[PDB]
């Protein structure tokens, strides 16, 4: 159950 | 314990909010709200860098006085406060404003009663009498429900779903009898289980949909004379169907949310074939809402304390092995701000991507994912 999507973090883009 | 894992995951979420959101506001209400809906009006403040938006909320308290609430929210052109409190008998299951007159709000109660309020006919602060004084009492149900939908094309037409297995239809412009009472124009008896939700079609005034614990989606036409047989019966899901919503841009598209942990997509031109199925692990879906600004965008909430935002246009897209680790490409964003089940959410109709979500632990959050996630 993710807290957020890692791909949606500003620094992962 | 689950509470230890929740508090820890909340702190991880909280620290990462500057990297996920362009806007995030958190407010603890006196009581939890089971309902959330933005009012359509925006009050621009002279010389200030913010505008004032409003929300319909409710309370859920079992010992104390319940209220229907109008909350104000300062949003960029950060305070959240209660403007209006109106006595309500029992918790506000759902509260929705009339599309032809945003001063008129219908409420579902934890009883057979469906109430109609004109908030401008009430003071901002309620009388200490403890008396619930709705402008109308709508009769027709034997039991409580949550499902509530106003007809956006036919002034005063309201649908309600109940635990009594029926759908009631009222015309609130009809002459009231006895004590501000309006009897149901029609009662739709197609389901053989608790009706969870109702929704009018957004272009055809005579068409509506309904979903129930019988695992069916029913399509109804009010122009038909038999109120016990729907136009179509769709074997929509493998478990209870909790919600449905019609796409505001396409007159053929609708979505259903279910206890089978999926959101299904439907086309009225081909109901024998499910268009798509959005799947999310151990999450019984209770609310589905289409974006009022973008045709391909919809959001869902269930029991897993998360809010999922989906993008239809990204279905069947090529993903990098790194991206593919977060899930299917149609899963645009996950909001993990809540520490309890989300009871309701609403898209801001004036400011794109802004959402208000409310949870069982009394939290209300006003948030907007980073511009970057969708562009």
DSSP state string for B18-80: HHHEEEEEEEE-SS--S-EEEEEEEEE-TT-SEEEEEEEEE---SSS-EEEEEEEEEEE---E
Local structure of B266: helix, strand or coil: strand
End-to-end CA distance of chain B, in Å?
39
Question: CB-CB: which of B282, B332, B336 is closest to A3?
Answer: B336
| Contact between B325 and A6 using a beta-carbon 8 Å cutoff | yes
What does the block give as tokens for B157? 């037409």
For residue B177, what is the DSSP state? B
The answer to whether A5 contacts B16, with C-beta atoms less than 8 Å apart, is no
**Per-residue exposure over B130-161, b if at least 16 CB sit within 10 Å of its own CB, e if not:** eebbbbbbbbbbeebbbbbbbbbeeebbbbbb
CB B257 within 8 A of CB B285: yes
Asked if B54 contacts B107 with a C-beta cutoff of 8 angstroms, the reply is: no
B304 contacts A4? CB cut-off 8 A? no
A chain contacts of residue B16, beta-carbon cutoff 8 Å: 3-4, 9
Contacts of B20 in chain A (CB under 8 A): 4, 8-10
CATH class of residue range B1-375? mainly beta
- Written as six digits, the tokens of B224 are 């038909």
Q: Which residue in chain A has the smallest CA separation from B338?
A: A3
Nearest-neighbour CA in chain B from A1: distance (Å): 7
Distance CA B362, CA B61 (A): 10
Q: Which spans in chain B are helix H?
A: 2-20, 371-374
- Spatial CA neighbour of A13 closest among B368, B326, B291: B326
Q: What is the number of other CB atoms lying within 10 angstroms of the CB of residue B357?
A: 22
Run of H or E residues at B72: strand B66-76
């Amino acid at each position: 159950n993710p807290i957020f999507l890692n791909r949606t973090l500003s620094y992962m883009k | 314990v689950e509470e230890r894992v929740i508090n820890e995951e909340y702190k991880i979420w909280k620290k990462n909010t500057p990297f996920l959101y362009d806007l995030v506001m958190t407010h603890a209400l006196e009581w939890p709200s089971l309902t959330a809906q933005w009012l359509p009006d925006v009050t621009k403040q002279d010389g200030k860098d913010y505008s004032v938006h409003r929300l319909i909320l409710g309370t859920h308290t079992s010992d104390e006085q319940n209220h229907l609430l109008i909350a104000s929210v300062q949003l960029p052109s950060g305070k959240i406060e209660i403007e209006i409190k109106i006595n309500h008998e029992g918790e506000v299951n759902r509260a929705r404003y009339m599309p032809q007159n945003a001063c008129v709000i219908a409420t579902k109660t934890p009883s057979s009663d469906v109430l109609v309020f004109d908030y401008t006919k009430h003071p901002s602060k309620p009388e200490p009498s403890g008396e619930c004084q709705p402008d109308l009492r709508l009769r027709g149900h034997q039991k409580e429900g949550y499902g509530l939908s106003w007809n956006p094309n036919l002034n005063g037409y309201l649908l309600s779903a109940s635990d009594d297995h029926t759908i009631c239809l009222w015309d609130i412009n009809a002459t009231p009898k006895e004590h501000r009472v309006i009897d149901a124009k029609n009662i739709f008896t197609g389901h053989t289980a608790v009706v969870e939700d109702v929704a009018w079609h957004l272009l055809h005034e005579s068409l509506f949909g309904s979903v129930a614990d019988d695992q069916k989606l029913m399509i109804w036409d009010t122009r038909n004379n038999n109120t016990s047989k729907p136009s179509h019966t769709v074997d929509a899901h493998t478990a209870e169907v909790n919600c449905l919503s019609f796409n505001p841009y396409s007159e053929f598209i609708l979505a259903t949310g279910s206890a089978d942990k999926t959101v299904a997509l439907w086309d009225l031109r081909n109901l024998k074939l499910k268009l798509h199925s959005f799947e999310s692990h151990k999450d019984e879906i209770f609310q589905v809402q289409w974006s009022p600004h973008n045709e391909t965008i919809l959001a869902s909430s269930g029991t897993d304390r998360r809010l999922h935002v989906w993008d239809l246009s990204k279905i069947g897209e090529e993903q990098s092995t790194e991206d593919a680790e977060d899930g299917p490409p149609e899963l645009l964003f996950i909001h993990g701000g809540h520490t309890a089940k989300i009871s309701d959410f609403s898209w801001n109709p004036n400011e794109p991507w802004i959402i208000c979500s409310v949870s069982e632990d009394n939290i209300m959050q006003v948030w907007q994912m980073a511009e970057n996630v969708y562009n």
